[PDB]
């Protein structure tokens, strides 16, 4: 139950109750062009910069009001890499894809402008104690 570390990165999953970032505007609905064993390719995402979707997840409706979610290893051009393979993904079903946050403060503010809620500690201190040996 620690769930706390004094590191540079955000230490928060994009969209959690701590980031307070609304992903609904960033939702993208698309029909995949081609599905392979490990790669799902679509031309619509080809218009975004490389790594835009890295860290995001893909959710689609299985039955009723329940959706199955899959994380994305990497995004490059028109090809998306799916962790654990693409098995179970419908070839023509409607898919919802959300972006992913790298966690860096520059990434957090330039893309999402959520710097005030940034949970990371970029440049407060790395080691400096007040009971060391020589300050200089």
Partner 1 sequence: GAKPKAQTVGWRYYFDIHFALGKKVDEVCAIRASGKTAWKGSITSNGQ
Partner 2 sequence: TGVAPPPPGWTPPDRTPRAITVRRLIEAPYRELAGVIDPANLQLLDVSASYLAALAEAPTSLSQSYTLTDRVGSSGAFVDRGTGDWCPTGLLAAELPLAAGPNVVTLTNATRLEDVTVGQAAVVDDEIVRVDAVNYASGTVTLARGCADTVPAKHLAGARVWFYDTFEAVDETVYSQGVTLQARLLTNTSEGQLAPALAATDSLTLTGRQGKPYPPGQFRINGSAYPTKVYGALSVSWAKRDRIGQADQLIDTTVGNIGPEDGATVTLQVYSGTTLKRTYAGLTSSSWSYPLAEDMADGPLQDVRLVLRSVRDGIDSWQQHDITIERHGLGFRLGE
DSSP codes, 25-41: TT-EEE--SEE-SSEEE
Sign of CA dihedral 118, 123, 127, 132: negative
From residue 95 to residue 124, the character string flagging contacts with partner 1 as x (rule: CB under 8 A) and all else as - is: --------------------------x--x
Q: Does 55 bind partner 2 (CB under 8 A)?
A: yes
Which among 28-36, 60-68, 86-94, 120-128 is the span making contact with partner 2, rule CB under 8 A?
120-128
Q: Give CA angle at 81 (76, 83), nearest 5°.
A: 145
Distance CA 113, CA 130 (A): 34
CA distance 86 to 109: 32
Residue 131 binding partner 1, by CB under 8 A: no
102 binds, among partner 1, partner 2, Fe ion, none (CB under 5 to 8 A by kind): partner 2
126 contacts partner 1 (rule: CB under 8 A): no
- Return the number of the residue (5 or 66) whose C-beta is nearest partner 2: 5
Alpha carbon distance 24, 108 (integer Å): 17
Q: Judged by CB, which is closer to partner 2: 77, or 90?
A: 77
Q: How far is the CB of 60 from partner 2 (least distance, A)?
A: 22
> Which of partner 1, partner 2, Fe ion, none has residue 4 at its interface (CB below 5 to 8 Å by kind)?
partner 1
Q: CA nearest 99: which of 19, 30, 15?
A: 15
């Amino acid at each position: 139950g620690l769930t706390d570390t004094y590191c540079r990165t955000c230490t928060a999953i994009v969209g959690d109750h701590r980031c307070k970032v609304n992903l609904v505007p960033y939702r993208v609905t698309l029909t995949p062009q081609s599905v392979s064993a490990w790669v799902i390719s679509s031309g619509v995402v080809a218009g975004y910069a490389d790594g835009w979707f890295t860290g995001g997840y893909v959710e689609w409706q299985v039955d009723g009001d329940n959706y199955d979610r899959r994380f994305i290893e990497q995004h490059a051009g028109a090809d998306l890499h799916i962790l654990g393979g693409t098995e179970g993904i419908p070839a023509g079903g409607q898919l919802r894809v959300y972006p992913g946050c790298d966690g860096l403060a520059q990434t957090c503010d330039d893309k999402f402008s959520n710097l005030p809620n940034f949970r990371g500690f970029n440049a407060m201190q790395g080691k400096s104690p007040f009971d060391g040996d020589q300050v200089w």
